[PDB]
Design a protein around this ligand. Structure first.
Ligand SMILES: COc1ccc([C@H]2CCCC(=C(c3ccc(O)cc3)c3ccc(O)cc3)C2)cc1
Ligand SMILES: COc1ccc([C@H]2CCCC(=C(c3ccc(O)cc3)c3ccc(O)cc3)C2)cc1
Lengths: 9, 230, 230, 9
């Protein structure tokens, strides 16, 4: 999940 | 939570400072509009806006105190709502026009190039006319947009913390209206009028979403955000 | 008009008196039988809704065309908020009719009904947690009728909308709520309307799909209401 | 439409 990754950043 | 201790002024300042930038489109004005090209412009623009929206959400008071799974859910549910209200806000000073970007200004006639988009265009324009009629302020806009982020997905799976932040943004809105010289009755009325528009924004997002994941070159992020609504 | 002249108490009484009756179902389920009962019930409720709408203060002052547009846009929202209200005293269940009380497991009888069943149940729990009063409910339902289609056309409509807002505040103030608690509760109630709109949109999406048109012969009236949303 | 008829009745 890209959204979950970008939120992790 | 630092959000539950913020005064109305600090709430506004935090939201105003967290505001994402206004991005530009690729759009070459020397070539006429086609259904594929214009959809490409809007898709490319929305994809880059999504990146800024994600980092904007983190700066929204109370959003960082939520779990990652909940953060994903709220954004998946309201991303098009947030995009649309942003569009409507940018287009407030341009009657009959939708300002997707400073270099991309479109009327409802240019919306006919994509089958079934002119219906959404008219709803967005009507919402923009409503904001212009109500003379919506920027301080009110950032409050409404933050409300959408926290409210739109809160009833589809803590929640007590979210409603507490929602209550604070409500206090913030009332504080702004009282500062604008509005009477107590005028404050409650304007508060109602603003929140009722969110029902229409939700409608536009749903009707918009329904067309987008139908029989429609989208980015992987935009695809995942769209597939969240199946 | 004559709706603006009425007091806040005369508004409540007029809405409470205009309340439609609670109809009964047609006395285990399959997909066909489940949809049959719901369709038959919804079709009979629509007849009472239309007559309820005319008894809503300021709705008769509207032109025939505008009355049609508002009802076509909000009919499922009105049906759903009524369902949610009836199910308030029945946690985990949906009271379609006094002889038709269903839970989320019975929502699995129809493909894609469970997700919306859960949204309805979540709305009912929200109403229960807020301890929603009948006086507040009739205001919300009237707001849905007047607001949901007001931006797809109206100064009179927004005037009545403000009047219901005044009515809502008057109810909370007469309940012992402080000034902050009043506009906070007002905000919380109106944000739920965004979810009601969402449930309606997602519900409408399945209902006018060809696979749901063919599962059971729907009435001509219910088809016309469905075809209004394409 | 049927809605017209039910509204005028
Ligand atoms: C086929 O029917 C259609 C076609 C396109 C739409 C649009 C038009 C209004 C603006 C919308 C979009 C939009 C909204 C805000 C914004 O800043 C930038 C872009 C959009 C969103 C996602 C996407 O993949 C493409 C565009 C959605 C709606 C219905
Ligand atoms: C295929 O996916 C589905 C299947 C069923 C639904 C429902 C479930 C929630 C209640 C809804 C309906 C409903 C709502 C309130 C009420 O008193 C009486 C009836 C409904 C509306 C129209 C219709 O032709 C049939 C039912 C709609 C939603 C999606």
């Amino acid at each position: 999940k890209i959204l979950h990754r970008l939120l992790q950043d | 939570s630092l959000a539950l201790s913020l005064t109305a002024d600090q709430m506004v300042s935090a939201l105003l400072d967290a505001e994402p930038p206004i991005l530009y489109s690729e759009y070459d004005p020397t070539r006429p509009f086609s259904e594929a090209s214009m959809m490409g412009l809007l898709t490319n623009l929305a994809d880059r806006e999504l990146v800024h929206m994600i980092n904007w959400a983190k700066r929204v008071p109370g959003f960082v105190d939520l779990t990652l799974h909940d953060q994903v859910h709220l954004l998946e549910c309201a991303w098009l709502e947030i995009l649309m209200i942003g569009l409507v806000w940018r287009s407030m000073e341009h009657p009959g026009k939708l300002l997707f970007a400073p270099n991309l200004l479109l009327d409802r006639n240019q919306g006919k190039c994509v089958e079934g988009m002119v219906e959404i265009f008219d709803m967005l324009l009507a919402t923009s006319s409503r904001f212009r009629m109500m003379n919506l302020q920027g301080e009110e806009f950032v409050c409404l947009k933050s409300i959408i982020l926290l409210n739109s997905g809160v009833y589809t799976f803590e929640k007590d913390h979210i409603h507490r932040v929602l209550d604070k943004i409500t206090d913030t809105l009332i504080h702004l209206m009282a500062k604008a010289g509005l009477t107590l009755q005028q404050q409650h009325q304007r508060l109602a009028q603003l929140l009722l528009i969110l029902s229409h924004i939700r409608h536009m997002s749903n009707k918009g979403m329904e067309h987008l994941y139908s029989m429609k070159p989208l980015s992987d992020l935009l695809l995942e955000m769209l597939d969240a609504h199946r």
